Design a protein around this nucleic acid. Structure first.
Lengths: 93, 98, 104, 87, 98, 79, 92, 108
DNA sequence: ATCAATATCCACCTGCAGATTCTACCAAAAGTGTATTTGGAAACTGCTCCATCAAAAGGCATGTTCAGCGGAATTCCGCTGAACATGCCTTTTGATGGAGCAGTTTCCAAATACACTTTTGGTAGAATCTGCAGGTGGATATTGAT
DNA sequence: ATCAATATCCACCTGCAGATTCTACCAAAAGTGTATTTGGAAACTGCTCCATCAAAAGGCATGTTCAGCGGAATTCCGCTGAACATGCCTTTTGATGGAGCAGTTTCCAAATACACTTTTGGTAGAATCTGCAGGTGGATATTGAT
């Protein structure tokens, strides 16, 4: 089985543009984008943690990585969205 | 006889190709170049058709971006005609032979 | 039994991402919050580029987003263009742009 | 065809009209006659370098078939990340 | 009343400075700029002596190379006087403006 | 101003090591602006590594790690 | 605070028995060895993951080297490497 | 006295035990073969010799016996291959190579 | 061709700041000996898709003509940068509190690890659906001669 | 400016292939729930080394003068863009055999996993040496004026 972020890309697509679809070649590019960004971020997290003699990658490493990688406004918003999601996941119980 | 002045059809073409995305190098010929180079590198190799398309996609994106830089180097010289010296200046600065 | 994505209010898979972190060997341990924070960031970013690609399609009178649409959305946005300044979007073409001195 | 023949001089398959079209998308208005051979040379080096790594990734996987991933990984190494072929 | 012609001393300076490796920017002023730029990112910061040194070493190494590419661009346009358009073109092809 | 602390004679000296023979009057300002952008980009990353390690002192390694991320790998101060 | 400094010095004495080295130079060498280590190790990491393998072996180190070093340098690096593993494998 | 070091077995100056330790704690893979740290240490030693050998000559050539940064820069940027390998590296206190574009020389 | 002014080399000298050889306390390594576990090679093989042969036809490459106009070479002339030496400010150099950077001890929240149980994202296989590519006509520019 | 040749714009329009639609099996995930383990935050602290203040040290700002460099204007030519005729080779649609890629069970060499013992590489305070960088002196090459 070959996993893809496709169904998830499609859900979000419908949220921002209810009546728009995507060609498979476009979805393919989108899948590469999600994998690429994932690797860069995890990668940054990985090093960040080593530079600190830390065997664990936490929401905190993921955040500094995002800060190091994304441009101004994108970074501001991503940090916000992630903080927000952690806080909420945290509060389910 | 009607005749467009030199440079008119050239701009027409720029607008034409900048408005599109199809590859500009003939497919089969490009594939043979790939096979020739790969072969004079390691005999008996096979290629997924999509590996050749990925190479053509990247090579054309590479050359187009290079021509832009070249165009800028020519204009820097107050010219509109790109020459080898321009392609070489752009690659030297790009760090491809700097 | 609820998924962690739902628990986090996310559309992206929190379990898949926590799994991918492990198998990718990035650290001895991976905290619980990491995949949650990363799945959100991933989702946030695809929303942004899909918003812009959708508009590009609209502008070119198209309903289905194709590669050129992604390319226009990325190259026309400073941040995204910078985030992908060394990425090549196959079948995306370039932005129309003719230097001044070339005109009549 | 009837067959099995020698690959030779295929760099000339990169025709002058095709190079011209590329310079066009590149926003170039006038092209000196010496550009075509210089361009073939630049393209050949580019290709040799991506194919060399791609094919290296193939050998390491003890395969006979160069995959799109091989090309995709070779491109990443080279700083020319490609989207749309599995990476 | 002796006098060296225009450029004779410049050439002499080129020769001298390409032989040496000492930093060419006065430290104190450099340190002020570093600290000032940093204060915009986090207030009340301290700097290891070596941190400031690594930054200066990196900055001169960077500028000097940028001055090399700038020169090539001026020369490409048949000049010997580097100008801003020359720095602009270089950084632009370096992708620092892309 | 501090950026003005990066003097003409120093910029001229750099240019020299870079092989430049004649320098237009407008280069000096242009250079500072370039130097300024450089430092902001690098320092911003270093300081991010400082805070990450909950410190109030930027370290040579914080700068070296920053430089490496900018594709400006530096030998001589660690790593 | 570990460093390759001593082994760097040993190698120096085999190559230039009567040549010394300043601190700043030793520091530069140290960075050099760490940089190459990281570059080579990293590629070997990718190599294994691409092929869904759990182990980084000499195989991975060699290919990593082929991909990283320039032609002739790579050639010799591959031999030195192969040599050392052999000598090692042939010793009680 | 006896227990022989791995580096000595592989006949190397570089620390095999350490390279091995560094590969593991580096998070590069789940497992690490026995030969990798040997092979890899062999490669680092070789490259280290390659530069020191060249930088040493730069020292000789300058009537100097102690290798300094300048010597290392001169050795690297004068070697096509080493230069390419360190194409995006900056050697502190290395300076540049003496070089003046011809068109800038006095018109003799 | 003839000096006159300077900058550049060079051989020798020497003080000291940074390189070194020594000693010893030692914890983090690294090697070693034993029991346990497991990744991934070998062997069999199902089945995807790569190489290739075939035919037809028209999109496009090739090659020629012709002359517009862009590029380079040459003369010119302001004005802008280089050289300079004039007098002074900031920087560099070296010495002293202190606030953080780490070394250490601790215990708790959080992360394995593991055994089930349950929900899901893939898939290949049927079938219907649907945006748009590409053909068409003709009405609105855009060009270029006059 | 007016006018004729041509290219571009574009809304209208339907067959087709690529996208969206189930019905299905599903073992691979992801979630659920103890039990065991521990990483790293938090508090307390002792020594570095970083920031700051005084002072002796020296490169920069400033104004003048002018030669030479860079852009403007003028000119000539040969090269590269249009336009056109001709025809082959790329593109397309299909089928075919089989080479490899990729799946599955199997099982041993190699690797993790403690535990025990030996040792080496780093830190530290002390003591000593030594490569070489400024510093001198005098010779001589370079540069520029006449």
């Amino acid at each position: 089985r070959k996993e893809s972020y496709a169904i998830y890309v499609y859900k979000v697509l419908k949220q921002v543009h209810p009546d728009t679809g995507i060609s498979s070649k476009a979805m393919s590019i989108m899948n590469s984008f999600v994998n690429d960004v994932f690797e860069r971020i995890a990668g940054e997290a990985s090093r960040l943690a080593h530079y600190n003699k830390r065997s664990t990658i936490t929401s905190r490493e993921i955040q500094t990585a995002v800060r190091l990688l994304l441009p101004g406004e994108l970074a501001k918003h991503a940090v916000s969205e992630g903080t927000k999601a952690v806080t909420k996941y945290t509060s389910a119980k | 006889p009607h005749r467009y002045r030199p440079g008119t059809v050239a701009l027409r073409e720029i607008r034409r190709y900048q408005k599109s995305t199809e590859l500009l190098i003939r497919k089969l010929p490009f594939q043979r170049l790939v096979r020739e180079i790969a072969q004079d590198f390691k005999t008996d190799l096979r290629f997924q058709s999509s590996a050749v398309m990925a190479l053509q996609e990247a090579s054309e994106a590479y050359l187009v971006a290079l021509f832009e830089d070249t165009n800028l180097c020519a204009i820097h010289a107050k010219r509109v005609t790109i020459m080898p010296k321009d392609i070489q200046l752009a690659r030297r600065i790009r760090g491809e032979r700097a | 039994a609820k998924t962690r994505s739902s628990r986090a209010g996310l559309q992206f898979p929190v379990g898949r991402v926590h799994r991918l972190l492990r198998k990718g060997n990035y650290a001895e341990r991976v905290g619980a919050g990491a995949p949650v924070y990363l799945a959100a960031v991933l989702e946030y970013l695809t929303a942004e580029i899909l918003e812009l690609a959708g508009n590009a399609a609209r502008d070119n009178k198209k309903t289905r987003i194709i590669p050129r649409h992604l390319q226009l959305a990325v190259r026309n946005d400073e941040e995204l263009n910078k985030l992908l300044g060394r990425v090549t979007i196959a079948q995306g073409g370039v932005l129309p742009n003719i230097q001044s001195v070339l005109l009549p | 065809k009837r067959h099995r023949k020698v690959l030779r001089d295929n760099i000339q398959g990169i025709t002058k009209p095709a190079i011209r079209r590329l310079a066009r998308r590149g926003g170039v208005k006038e092209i000196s006659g010496l550009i075509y051979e210089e361009t073939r040379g630049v393209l050949k080096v580019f290709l040799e370098n991506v194919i060399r790594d791609a094919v290296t990734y193939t050998e390491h996987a003890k395969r006979k078939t160069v995959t799109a991933m091989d090309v995709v990984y070779a491109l990443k190494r080279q700083g020319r990340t490609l989207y749309g072929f599995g990476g």
